Amino acid sequence: VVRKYAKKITEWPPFEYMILATIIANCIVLALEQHLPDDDKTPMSERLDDTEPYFIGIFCFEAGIKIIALGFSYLRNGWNVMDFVVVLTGILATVGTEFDLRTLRAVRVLRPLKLVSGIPSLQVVLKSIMKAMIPLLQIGLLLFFAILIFAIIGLEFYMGKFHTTCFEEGTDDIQGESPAPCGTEEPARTCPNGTKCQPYWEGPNNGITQFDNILFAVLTVFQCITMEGWTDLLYNSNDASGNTWNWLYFIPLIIIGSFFMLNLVLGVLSGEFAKERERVENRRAFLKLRRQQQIERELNGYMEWISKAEEVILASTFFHKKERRMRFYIRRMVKTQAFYWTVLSLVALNTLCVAIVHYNQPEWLSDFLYYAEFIFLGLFMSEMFIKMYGLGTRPYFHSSFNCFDCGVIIGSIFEVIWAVIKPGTSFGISVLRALRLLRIFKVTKYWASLRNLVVSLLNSMKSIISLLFLLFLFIVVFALLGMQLFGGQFNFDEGTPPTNFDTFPAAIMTVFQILTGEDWNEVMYDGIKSQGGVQGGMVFSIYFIVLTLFGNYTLLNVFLAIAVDNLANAQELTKDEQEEEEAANQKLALQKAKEVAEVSNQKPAKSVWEQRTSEMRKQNLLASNPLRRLCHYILNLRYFEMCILMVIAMSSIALAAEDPVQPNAPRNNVLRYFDYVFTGVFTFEMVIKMIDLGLVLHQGAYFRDLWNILDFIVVSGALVAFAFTGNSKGKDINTIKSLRVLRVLRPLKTIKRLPKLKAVFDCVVNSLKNVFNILIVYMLFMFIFAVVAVQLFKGKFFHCTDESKEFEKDCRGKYLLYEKNEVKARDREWKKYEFHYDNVLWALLTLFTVSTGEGWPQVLKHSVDATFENQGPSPGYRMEMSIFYVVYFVVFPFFFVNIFVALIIITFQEQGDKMMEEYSLEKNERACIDFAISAKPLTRHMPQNKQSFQYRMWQFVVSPPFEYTIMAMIALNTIVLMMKFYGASVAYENALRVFNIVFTSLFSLECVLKVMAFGILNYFRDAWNIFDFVTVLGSITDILVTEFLSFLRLFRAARLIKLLRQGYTIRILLWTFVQSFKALPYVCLLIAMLFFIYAIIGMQVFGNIGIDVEDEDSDEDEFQITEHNNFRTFFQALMLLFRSATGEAWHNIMLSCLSGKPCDKNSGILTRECGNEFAYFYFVSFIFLCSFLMLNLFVAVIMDNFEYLTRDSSILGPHHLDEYVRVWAEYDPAAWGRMPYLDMYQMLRHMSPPLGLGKKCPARVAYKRLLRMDLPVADDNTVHFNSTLMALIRTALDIKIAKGGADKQQMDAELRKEMMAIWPNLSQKTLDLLVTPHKSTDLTVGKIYAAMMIMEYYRQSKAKKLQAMREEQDR
């Protein structure tokens, strides 16, 4: 909308830079604002606020220039639309205030996003991120359906249960400060003497967490899906209803909601990243990278060649000819391996020296280390100068390695002077010298893989920096939005939480915490509480839901894409140089023959990632002693090995029944006799295995096999335990109790014997070998962080229970603790924090806890409040220490962990399958042909027993009006289950129940109507029909009983699943992954054994700890071993290991299991001697092993369906072939198996390529494919179902399509042999059915169609042929 073209003036480069500058200034101004409660302003607020007219005027001016120049193509760009709305909303608020316009100020948060619009480079990177998450939307649709279904189920069971508590008998007052749900029955929690269970209490978490509405249930379910706070619901519902069945709701909720969805997200993303790599634009960048590396390798060889010759030439520089030679002499020494290894050994000493430091080191140690730092610093500075003079200033500095040595040397000087100026702060910068230890990988074969990874990372440094900036920008926008929504609103009566949005530094760290998903629910409760409460502030949960939902998967997308792309580049880059080096050597040796002519392990076959990646490259490019013989005999006997397997199974079950709490329980007395028998069986099999084999190392030694030692340990420990008990039963209880623990190795004896369980075990060990080299780098980097953390926070993690006292001497005596309406006297104690950094070993445990993500907000709070050594905390003292934990998250949890996930995906090997390159085809041609081997037309009845009645009523059942009626009722029926709510009137409850009777009637008619139409037998052969039938039968059952609990009507809640069949891509994705879990049963078994072994160890070691202990102190973090969480039974142990696997405060459980804890009343121990220091190893190893085994399960399921995940719609695939089946069912309604060919051409028109011709295909081109079919034509006009499906696949995939003539005679002979070679199981007659034996007598499918296409080309010419003479005749 302009005056056409009239002196329209365009932009010049400084203009957009001025715009960029003003945007950055506006961002700073927004970041400098502080919000105060209740209409209070800071003095700087007015000065910052009055700047808004200038910024809005500049933005309006630039928008005006652009709008007049383009002419209002301004709104064509999406970025300009975002710019326009920013300008529009600002002017409305800035100019005029009559309407309520405080809300419109919230739109200013989007202004930082104008950086993306201004900088075109950021737009390209932003396009990459959004492109990958387009497929992920279909996962979100599965996630929403899962949440909806579980919200309905939770609504039915848990509606309103949490509103009763232990009220005082006399008054309507809560008994204690912390209330819990109660019950009036024994299974539920019972109130003490002084109280009773009264009707109304607000509920847990101030009533925010509950199941009262469908909206409350959906929000509550979403919280459990994120695995944050889900155990508190499990314990609360156990108090209300008893613990018999509540685990059936929550355990499936976590597995399906959290672990299964995470599997699809990794699967879909990994497939997308594989397809992105083989894009034409991405391949060209890699090809440039490969060529540039080849130049560097060759150039390095030539540089050393001339360098050696230059020294050959060399043989007051003129007088001191030696002066040139000392430069040459020490140049030699630098190169020598003696120098290289000697300086490297010095680095090991320096790395050791900085690790010794601890909180109270002896004074002699401090003096030694104080001088040793100068000695090490002096040696490395001298080592700098020797290379500088020895190699020259220019050659030295140009080396990348030497520049890094310069930085640490310069940094080390900075620290020592900094210590003198400002004593009290040491950063331990010298530890960065330990990174030189990674050069040791050069001697190994692993250097090529590691160097190439760093090469690829440095190549894409520009992309990585842009990715982090965009990720940082979205944090700033959400931080600014949080300040607007929750400003000075967190000033609660109790106090202002540490996580508040008052200031910009506080808003970033609160937003960052929600992204990591730790205690995001706790922050949500504060945000809801600030705005009214549960009554009025429930709409503010959307800010937290969107932030954690988007942040969870945006972080995964950004960091996994970085890891996959760079690791895949390194693998290809490494493989190419190895084959290039091999090929060049063979060529050189061949050339060596001409010169002399005058006188003349096994590498695994690629991987699932590499094999698929190579195929996509081709397809894209193509388109462009008498006793011993006895002892050997028993071992051969299958009954013996089958018998011993049964004994192993029974031995494991015995370990699970034993009662830990009662050593003298009657059950343990009975089970003790069983222990004698099981050892006896294991003793007998041990000796005969020694007799059949040999103890001595004769290459068949019994002790040679590793599992044999494992068998030897179990039996030996049991025998020795008997000897100690034999002498005196209770002389030494400690060691015998330790030896009894070795029985937990009995389940591991199963792995060797079961063949497929051993195979799964070898795959897990194979994965460890691949990631071992990265694992060493991971620990070296984590070691550096631990040493730095020690220097920062050594001795500063001390506090006094009395806040005021900040020294140990002051913290003595008693103090007054002011609780609500009561004063209590408590002792003053100078105690250390639970997790601290007093040495490198304590630092690593603390950082490991932070890596798992649990409890790090508390560790961060302690880190910022630390003041000085041996002095107490002060709130907000050092707020710059937050940078330590932000940098730590970027490196290890975000970056290294996704390298571990990527590395396993790229290097995963095939599941057996023998060799698989002997057959030429392989690839995806198998799956399509395999389907063609086994297929059948979907039989549609067409009974004709009674055309008027029975067939007619059939056509109604299949009629679209009936089907859409079915979908409408199921949709309406679901909404009926969604309208239950707490406090509904008896009229409302009755009205809802009436609609149930209406629906269950109609849903019964559908079953009656289908059964008659389909028949008694055919109907009952479809899984959904039985599922539908059991659902109607269950619902109708309850109704009669009421007039003459209905949790089996929640089967009707599962009817919503039927709606999934309409959405195709979801149904295939859900079905394929489910099938993959069935094909991998032993992988699931390995995870079950890990839980079994760790459960039995927990019962024997940590079972004795008492739970009855409770006191007014109520240090809940101190005591996490309670009635709900303990090791007392096998099932109570498994729940503890599942809570820890999800990560719910596992670090506090580990501390609760340590030594010096009260024992149980009946444990038989009368002193406070319970728990072990084994709790450190018990939990730390479990978290590593549980995450590793679960990850291998994920990749196994992902890499099983990797063909589908990396599918392309253009190229034929097995998923397409199902479309052929439904079409064939209709054109052949009776499913005769024979269809006349006049229907066939119409069939090909209906289906899109590559399976069908498609609507817009040229007729003559369509005829070309028809000849390509080359199949015999039946004289009844029919085409076989199996034979026809074969050729359509062959035509599309170009599977050895012959040039014609004699070739067709050979390929049919050939292809039939491949399919015979692949499977000899297929029937020969059926094999000839799919591919007919060649018969030139039978006319091909082309021949009938060749009648039209060849003649129609002539037929149009025939009219022109008669024409050609005709105008010539007239002329």
Ligand X SMILES: CC(C)CCC[C@@H](C)[C@H]1CC[C@H]2[C@@H]3CC=C4C[C@@H](OC(=O)CCC(=O)O)CC[C@]4(C)[C@H]3CC[C@]12C
Ligand Y SMILES: CCCCC/C=C/C/C=C/C/C=C\C/C=C\CCCC(=O)O[C@H](COC(=O)CCCCCCCCCCCCCCCCC)COP(=O)(O)O[C@@H]1[C@H](O)[C@H](O)[C@@H](OP(=O)(O)O)[C@H](OP(=O)(O)O)[C@H]1O
Ligand Z SMILES: CCCCCCCCCCCCCCCCCC(=O)OC[C@H](COP(=O)(O)OCCN)OC(=O)CCCCCCCCCCCCCCCCC
- What does the binding site for ligand X look like in residue numbers (CB under 6 A)? 351-352, 355-356, 358, 360, 362, 468, 471-472, 475, 505, 508-509, 512, 653, 656-657, 666-667, 839-841, 876, 879-880, 882-883, 886, 1130-1131
Of the pair 467, 688, the CB lying nearest ligand X is at 467
For ligand Y, which residue of 20, 107, 891, 1050 counts as binding (CB under 6 A)?
A: 891
Q: How far is the CB of 1160 from ligand X (least distance, A)?
A: 15
What part of residues 1076-1105 is at the interface with ligand Z (CB under 6 A)?
A: 1088, 1091-1092
Distance CA 1283, CA 1245 (A): 19
| Choice between 853 and 1063, CB closer to Ca ion | 853
Compare residues 32 and 653 and give the one whose CB is closer to ligand X: 653
CB of 515 to ligand X, least distance (A): 8
Binding interface with ligand CLR (CB under 6 A)? 213-215, 427, 432, 516-517, 552, 555-556, 650, 653-654, 657, 666-667, 670-671, 784-785, 788, 792, 851-853, 880-881, 883-884, 887, 893-894, 897, 975, 978-979, 981, 1143, 1155, 1172-1174, 1177, 1183-1184, 1187
- Axis crossing angle, helix 13-31 with helix 461-485, rounded to the nearest 10: 50
Amino acid at 1241: Y
How far apart are CB 245 and ligand Z at their closest, in Å? 8
Residue 471 contact among ligand Y, ligand CLR, ligand X, none, beta carbon within 5 to 8 Å by kind: ligand X
Q: What's the one-letter identity of residue 260?
A: F
- Calpha distance 87→82 (Å, rounded): 9
Own/partner contacts of 99-106, CB < 8 Å, gap of 24 or more, are: 105/484, 106/481, 106/484, 106/485
Determine the 3-state secondary structure of 161 from DSSP.
helix
DSSP 954-1012: HHHHHSHHHHHHHHHHHHHHHHHHH---TT--HHHHHHHHHHHHHHHHHHHHHHHHHHH
Q: Is 62 annotated as a binding residue?
A: no
x/- binding map, residues 412-451, to ligand Y, per CB under 6 A? -----------------------xx-xx-x--------xx
Minimal distance, residue 561 CB to ligand X, in Å:
15
Stretches 52-60, 625-633, 716-724, 1128-1136: which one binds ligand Z (CB under 6 A)?
1128-1136
Nearer to ligand X, 1069 or 1134 (CB): 1134
355 binds, among ligand Z, ligand X, ligand CLR, none (CB under 5 to 8 A by kind): ligand X
d(CA 20, CA 1054): 55
Any known ligand binding at 572? Answer: no
What is the Cα–Cα distance from 514 to 551, expressed in whole angstroms? 8
Quick check: 775 binds ligand Y (CB under 6 A)? no
Pick one of ligand Y, ligand Z, Ca ion, none as the site partner of residue 1143 (Cβ within 5 to 8 A by kind): Ca ion
Task: Note whether 541 and 216 are within 8 A (CB).
Answer: no
Does 1138 participate in binding ligand Z (rule CB under 6 A)? yes
Report whether 196 contacts 167 (CB < 8 A).
yes
Tokens coding 1172: 């072990």
Amino acid at position 1106, single letter: G
Known binding residue 228? Answer is yes
Binding to Ca ion, residues 225-264 (CB under 5 A): 228
First to last CA, the chain: 61
State how far the Cα of 1236 lies from the Cα of 1243, in Å rounded to an integer: 11
Which residue, 355 or 1293, is less far from ligand X as judged by CB? 355
Tokens at 800, concatenated: 């006094």
Q: What is the three-state SS of 918-951?
A: CCCCCCCHHHHHHHHHCCCCCCCCCCCCCHHHHH
Query: How near is the Cβ of 620 to ligand Z at its closest, in Å?
Result: 42
CB 617 within 8 A of CB 280: no
Q: Least distance (Å) from ligand Y to the CB of residue 560?
A: 12
Q: Which window, 40-48, 514-522, 1126-1134, 1202-1210, contacts ligand Z (CB under 6 A)? A: 1126-1134
Stretch that binds Ca ion, among 186-194, 852-860, 1112-1120, 1310-1318 (CB under 5 A): 852-860
Torsion of CA 1132, 1133, 1137, 1143, to 10 degrees: 50
Structure tokens at 961: 């009006």
Measured in degrees and rounded to the nearest 5, phi and psi for residue 1351 equal -75, -35
- Residue closer to Ca ion (CB basis): 228 or 685: 228
SS3 label, residue 778: helix
Tally helices (H) and strands (E) across the chain.
54, 8
Residue of 807, 1131, 1184, 1353 interacting with ligand Z (CB under 6 A)? 1131
Q: Which one among 68, 69, 122, 251 touches ligand Z, defined by CB under 6 A? A: 251
Written as one letter, the residue type at 887 is: V
CB 966 within 8 A of CB 1059: no
> How many residues lie near ligand Z (CB under 6 A)?
13
Query: In terms of CB distance, is 137 or 248 closer to ligand CLR?
Result: 137
**Nearest distance from residue 137's CB to ligand X, in Å?**
24
Residue 777 within binding range of ligand Y, rule CB under 6 A = yes
Instruction: Give the ranges where 3-77 is alpha helix by DSSP (H).
Output: 13-31, 43-49, 52-70
**Partner from ligand X, ligand Y, ligand Z, none contacting 1088, C-beta within 5 to 8 A by type:** ligand Z
Select the binding partner of residue 895 from ligand Y, ligand CLR, Ca ion, none (C-beta < 5 to 8 A, by kind): ligand Y
Collapsed DSSP state (helix, strand, coil) of residue 816: strand
Q: Which amino acid is at 97?
A: T
- The 3-class secondary structure across 537-565, one letter per residue, is CHHHHHHHHHHHHHHHHHHHHHHHHHHHH
For the CB of residue 19, give the shortest distance to ligand X in the complex, in Å.
24
Least Cα distance to 831 among 1227, 1118, 538 occurs for 1118
| CB closest to ligand CLR, residue no | 981
* Residue 197 φ then ψ, to 5°: -90, 110
Interface map 191-230 toward Ca ion (x if CB under 5 A): -------------------------------------x--
SS3 content of the chain, % helix, strand, coil (to 5): 70, 5, 30
The angle subtended at Cα 944 by Cα 939 and Cα 949, nearest 5°, is 115
From the list 382, 399, 444, 1181, which residue makes contact with ligand Y (rule: CB under 6 A)?
A: 399
User: Shortest approach of ligand X to residue 883 CB, angstroms?
Assistant: 5
Instruction: Tell me if 853 contacts Ca ion by CB under 5 A.
Output: yes
Q: Examine residue 1202 and tell whether it contacts ligand Z (CB under 6 A).
A: no
Site membership for ligand Z, residue 1125 (CB under 6 A) = no
Q: Which is nearer to ligand Y, 702 or 889 (CB)?
A: 889
H/E run at residue 570: helix 541-595
Closer CB to ligand Z, 231 or 510, in the complex: 231
Q: Which residue is nearest to ligand X (CB)?
A: 879
Give, as one character, the DSSP assignment of residue 1105: B
Residue 1134 interface partner, choices ligand Y, ligand Z, Ca ion, none, CB cut-off 5-8 Å depending on type: ligand Z
HEC string of 1259-1319 equals: HHHHHHHHHHHCCECCCCCEEEHHHHHHHHHHHHHCCCCCCCCHHHHHHHHHHHHHHHHHC
Q: Which of 390, 660, 873, 1143 binds Ca ion (CB under 5 A)?
A: 1143
Binding segment for Ca ion among 121-129, 617-625, 671-679, 848-856 (CB under 5 A)?
A: 848-856
Return residues touching Ca ion (CB under 5 A): 228, 853, 1143
Give binding residues for Ca(2+) as ranges: 228, 518, 854
Give binding residues as ranges: 228, 518, 854
Return residues touching ligand Z (CB under 6 A): 243-244, 247, 251, 1088, 1091-1092, 1129, 1131-1132, 1134-1135, 1138
Return residues touching ligand Y (CB under 6 A): 399-401, 435-436, 438-439, 441, 450-451, 453-455, 457-458, 464, 777, 890-891, 895
